[PDB]
Every structure is written in C-alpha cells, then in structure tokens.
Amino acid sequence: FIPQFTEVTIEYLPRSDEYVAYYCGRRIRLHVLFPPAIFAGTVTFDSPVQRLYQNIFMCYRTLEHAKI
Amino acid sequence: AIPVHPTPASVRLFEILQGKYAYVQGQTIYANLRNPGVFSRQVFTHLFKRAISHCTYDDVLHDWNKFEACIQKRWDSCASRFRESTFESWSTTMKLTVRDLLTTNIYRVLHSRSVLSYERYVDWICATGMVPAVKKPITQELHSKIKSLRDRCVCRELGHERTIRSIGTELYEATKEIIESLNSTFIPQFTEVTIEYLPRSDEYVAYYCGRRIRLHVLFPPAIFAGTVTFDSPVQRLYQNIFMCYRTLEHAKICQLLNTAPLKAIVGDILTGSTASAIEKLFNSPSASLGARVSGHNESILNSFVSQYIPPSREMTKDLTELWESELFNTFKLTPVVDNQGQRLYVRYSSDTISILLGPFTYLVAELSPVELVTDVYATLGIVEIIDELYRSSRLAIYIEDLGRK
Amino acid sequence: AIPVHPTPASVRLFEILQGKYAYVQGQTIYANLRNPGVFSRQVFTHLFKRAISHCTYDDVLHDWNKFEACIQKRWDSCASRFRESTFESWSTTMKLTVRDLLTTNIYRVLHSRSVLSYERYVDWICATGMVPAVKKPITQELHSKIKSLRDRCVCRELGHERTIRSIGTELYEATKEIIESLNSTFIPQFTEVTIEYLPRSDEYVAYYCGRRIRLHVLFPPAIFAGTVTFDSPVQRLYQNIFMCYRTLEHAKICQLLNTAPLKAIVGDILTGSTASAIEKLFNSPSASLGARVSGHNESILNSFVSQYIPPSREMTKDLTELWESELFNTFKLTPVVDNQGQRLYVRYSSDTISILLGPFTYLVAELSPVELVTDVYATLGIVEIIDELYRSSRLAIYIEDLGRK
C-alpha cells in the first residue's frame, strides 16, 4: 500500500537517525532513497522539486506582484 | 587545526548541492551526472562478466551432444540441415535461458538495500574534492535478503542443463562476494559529519561520531593564510553564482520598491471580484509613496525620477550556459543531439567514467575485481547490453565454434 | 634573490587558477585541459606496449599446437574448415583471455593512490611556466597495495595457457617499476610552497620546509627591474581579466547606487506576503536618496540626473571568446563539433600532448621508457584502444601470421 500525503505524516529523529512513518497511530515500514539535509534550523530535501523550490516561489511572488 | 566542512563559507558552498540560494537552468544538468544507475550498470555488467567467464567449454559440448540425443528419439540426409536448424534454435534458447534467469537473479540482488550510494558520492567530489570513507561493520543484510533457493526455484524444469546448474550457482555465490564489498563500505551525508585539516604536519582528518575515519584526497584544496578554497567544479563558479543571486534579489528589491505609480516627497488577492479587488488595495498604503528628508530645516532644491530595472534574466541566462560549459568540460558530458537539437540526450563519455567512477569504484569503494565500461555499455539498453556481452562472450564464441558443427 | 611565488601580483595570478576573482564561460575550458586521466592513458598504453612486446613467437605456436591436441580428442576433410574455424575462435578467445586479464590488473594498478597528479602539474605550467620537481623518498605503498596472485587467481583455470603464464608475470613486475617512478616523484600545491629567483648569477630556487628542491624551467619569465612577468597563458590575459572584474564590480556598484526611484539634493525578503513586503521596505531608508553638498554656504545653481548602466555582460561576452581563443591557440585544442555545434567535444591535439604531457612525463617525471600517444589513442575508448592496439600488436600479428595456418 502507498497512501496520499494530506492525512499521513512522516517523522525523522536526529538522535540515532532513523525514520518513523505514521498512519492511524503506528510506525510503518519505510525506504530511504534521497536522504534530506537536516540543518539545525531547517530541513531541506534532495528532491527534483526542491531543487526548483524558491525559484518557483519567486515566480509566484512576481506574478502576484505583477497583478498587484 | 583549521576546519574544512562546517565553516560558513564551506557550508554556503555545500548548499548549492541543493537549490536553496540560487538556481538556474544550467544547474539542472548537475543532477544529471548525479544520477545513480551508472554505478548499477557498472556492477551489473561486471558480475555478468564474472558469471560468463568461469564457464567451461567441456560443459556445453556434451550438453549439445545430449541435446541431439534428446531429438533423435523425437525425430537422415535432411537430418543434416535439421541438426543445423535445431542447433541454431538451441543457441537462441541458450541465449534465452541464460538471459531470463540471469536478469531475474541479478535485478533481485542488485535492487535490494545498498547503503552505498553513488548519489551520495558524486556530490562530494564536485563540492570539495574530498570523500569521507566510512567502513560500517554491519554486514548482516545479504543473508537476510537473499540466502538460498532464489537461484534454484526458477531453474527446476525438464531439461537438466548442466551449464546453468554450474554457472548460476557460481554467480550466486559470486554476488555474495560483490554485494558484501559495497554494503560494507559507506559514504555519508554532509549536514552532520565534518572533515578537518591541520596546517603543521599536514594531513586531512575525517570525523563522524567522534572518531577518525578513512578518507581520500582527490582534488587538493587551497588553504591560504586567511581562507580555504577547494579546487572544485562548484567553487569554480562560486561568486558568479552568488553575484547572480545578489542581483536577482536586488532586482526584486527594486521591483518591490518602485511599485507605487507615483512618487511624492515630503516638505484571495490573486483571484476575486475585480471591482472589490480595486477597493481592497486602493485604501492600502501600498499605493502612496512620499519620501522623506531627515532635517526639517534641511530643504530640497530639486528632485528627479528614475525607475530602474537591472538586467535580472540577462544575468540568469548567461549563467545557465556558464553552468553548461563547466559541467560539459570538467566532467566530460557529450550531448547526443539531433539536427538543431536542444540538448536532448546528455550522456557520460569514455573519460568521464574514468574521472568519476574510475576513482569511485576503485579508491573510496574497495571493489577490486570490477572494471570500467564502454560508451555503448552505458548507452544501450540494460537488457540490450546482455546479448551484446553475449556477442563477445566466451560461451557464445564456444557456440559459434559449434556454429561450424 | 627576488621573490616569484609569494608576491601579491603573482598570487593574484595564482588565484585565477581557481575562480575566486573573475570567471566567465571561457574559463570553463580551462578545467577541460586540467582534466587528468590523459596521463593515465599515457602510462596505460605504455605498460600495454611493455606487456605486449615481451612475448615470444615460439610460445604461441606450440600453444596452438597443444590447442589442436586438445581438440582432436574432442573432435577429416571437413576438419580443414573445422580447424580454420576453431583457430578463428581461438584467436577471438585469445584476445578475450588476454583482455580480461589486463583489464583487471591494469585498472587495479592504475587507480592507486598516486601522489603525482596531472592536475597539480597543468595548473603550474600555465601559471608561470615553472614547475617544482620534488623527489619525496617514501615509496613503500606499492608492495602493500598489490603483492602477488592478483595476476594469478583470475587465470587459475582449466586451460593452462602459457601465453598469459609468461606475459602476465612480466607485465606484473613491469608495473612495479613504473608506479615506483611516478610515486617517487612529487608535484606540490602552491599555497604552502614557493618559487624564488636570484637575479645575480641567475638561477631559480624552490623551497618546501627550508630546502632547495629540483625544478625545471619551461617558459622563462620576464624579470624587469620593477616587476616580474611570466610568459604564461593566464598572464597573457591578466589585466584584461582584472579589467572585466573591475567593471563588473563597478557595474554592481552603480546598480546598487541608483536603486532609489527618486533623487533628492539637500541644501524572508525573497518570498513573502507582498502586501507586507511593500511595508517592510517602504519604511526602510533604502527608498530615499537625498544627495549632499558639503558647505552650507555653498549653493547649487543647477542639478542633473543620469543613471548609467556600464556594458557588464558585454564585457563578459567578448572575454569569454578571449579565453576560448587563447586556450585554443597556446594549447592546441581542436573542438570536435557537429554542424553548427556549440563546441561539444573539446579534445587534445597531436602537438598539444607534446607541449603538455611531452615535457611532463619526460622532464619533471623521470618516466624514461614511456611514449606519447596518438590522436585516436586518446580519442577512442580506454577499452576500445585495447583491441586497436591489438590490431597492430606483435602477438596478434603472430596470430595473423598464423592467420594463414
């Protein structure tokens, strides 16, 4: 089974680094492929979309700015 | 002792691995060489080569003899061309019967969990020219994922071919020798480990979990008396990337500061009913702009207006092909293109596997008996390289030896 | 005594090896000739030649004789073309069974830790025309990294081929003489060592940890009474690169200085809610600009406005092809291109290996018996040069001598 995103969540513990899935209150199995960069202030994911992320948000900002 | 990893300038360099500060179209090709899979192709054709090498000629000639003994009880002068045709079909199903079982077992052993990641490798060498070589002693996964009968369940058929009964077992134990070497090794992430260099009696010391771990210099970084610079593809573009980031945020700053339609000096929003959307921002203070002099006695003689657009997308566009030229040059990437093709098939070269997986598979990964590959070993289909290996294999040359009787 | 290395102008010159001050698309091609691996091609095909030469014709002819003795117990008038075909397949597996042996062993000895690097050489010659030749006496790593049986356990098989049992040992011990010569030598970095010139009774002095080291002039510098100039590729561009850097930082200065939309004379930001983003910088003092007259009695008769954009990207664009022409010319680089190709395959030439690896492998490296390569020795694949060497190799001409019986 693969779920959607909007009602399940995923948890990472930095201390003794593992990852914990959750859906209806249980830890479910998981598979790392692209492990994210956890800095002390934020976590960014090595992903195709987050390699574009703030450029897409910049384009959104200037488009709403243009309509403003 | 002077730090290498967790310095602010070095982690500013390590950020461009991801896209957090600046990103252009040319940086899309950076993940293209960051694609793993060329490493799987490496070990994939290597252990096919290891399987096809240890075969003997005497195991297959009496196999063809017993194959003819099978067909004589099922089926004189016409039997000459009958035996030629049934040997031709026997060669075709020989290629088939090696290909099917081999691609099952090898895609099974290959796509299990491997803690070694080429994805985790290629980002380091282009960032710093340094690799953290970690030897994780936990190696109890291979007997758990694939122990026995995976080579035996698929081959239990009528025709007891001793060729597969000799070679599948030898490759099956051989895969346990090769997956061991790769999952025993480890390349980590960057945001939690560190690398350290000392000036006096200079060595480079890798540190994760409080211990000196192995490592290899690949591109010797320049440590000046005030700063450290890494001979790296990314830091060769470093302040041009940061200058483009600066002028882009500068451009949006001036764009966001000149939004008033009129300049005075003192002496749900995205979609809605446009009539009310007029009202919801006309009362807003975004419309007005009255600039100020600090001193009230301080007076102004004259005033001028100049909105200014800095060439933002012009500064992005040339830095795209800046990235393109640099990652075509220091990593040999030949774009396989059509007539006026816009860079449709970006592929590894001959020498760029010698400069990426050349050091990788032999220095930071301790894979001794593996080889590098060709252009068409990596270009062609991953099952279409199997029969191409077969086209220059020891067994099929023995079969083409049998090709003339 | 006059300094050469640690002077401020020459370390400004040594910086542009890396990307710290100015960088354009033309300087991407600098890493392409900075790529090592062509040096591995050098020692690769040289030890190939040292392997393939030391055969005897008498070894392979009786090897074919015993090979026929093997096949007569396994398999009359048809035996004529049978013996022709089995010799053809025997030549094919002869190429195969030398090739897999050499491909393992020579990639194994090839990708060792080599403290000599082409990367540390090519930057030094193009910077100043001078290389420091260091003879570092520790040479104990070869016996530890490779001792015995790496040439043997791969060939421990049924057919005791005396061709590999004669030639693999000699190529094995030959690598022990060749990797010794390269790892005995040393080319250093720049940021810790220095080069020094005495004008009086002129020689050049090298230094690392207080000793005069060996060294080799290649492009003799111009030593004037005020400064030193080096006949080099990068110092032939030096103040043009600095001029482009100066006008680019000046361009950013004027761009940052004319950001105000309105000119008075006295007398989180990257992404956010744009309605609040207006508010966060309109109150900021970046918006206003009131220009100053120094004297309060000093009055102003007339006042002007002129924003000015200097041609920044224009100054980058011609200097790109400035770098391209210089690194196409003083290092002979022939771009293998397609019809209207955008410089897709930038490759070493015939004569540029004689001007770079020519002096390298023979003057600072004391690799005496090694040879240079062809165009198609460096162009073609590192496994596809094996069979091309085989197409003109003494063993395979002896097999083509056997090609007619």
Swiss-Prot record, chain A:
Q: What does this protein do?
A: Forms a portal in the viral capsid through which viral DNA is translocated during DNA packaging. Assembles as a dodecamer at a single fivefold axe of the T=16 icosahedric capsid. Binds to the molecular motor that translocates the viral DNA, termed terminase.
Q: Which species is listed as the source?
A: Epstein-Barr virus (strain B95-8) (HHV-4)
Which top-level group of life is the source organism from? Viruses
Where does the record place it?
Answer: Virion; Host nucleus; Host cytoplasm
The name of this protein is Portal protein
Q: Which family does it belong to?
A: Belongs to the herpesviridae portal protein family.
Oligomer status and interactors? Homododecamerizes. Interacts with terminase subunits TRM1 and TRM3.
Q: What is the lineage of its organism?
A: Viruses, Duplodnaviria, Heunggongvirae, Peploviricota, Herviviricetes
Q: Which residues of the full protein are shown?
A: 206 to 273 of 613
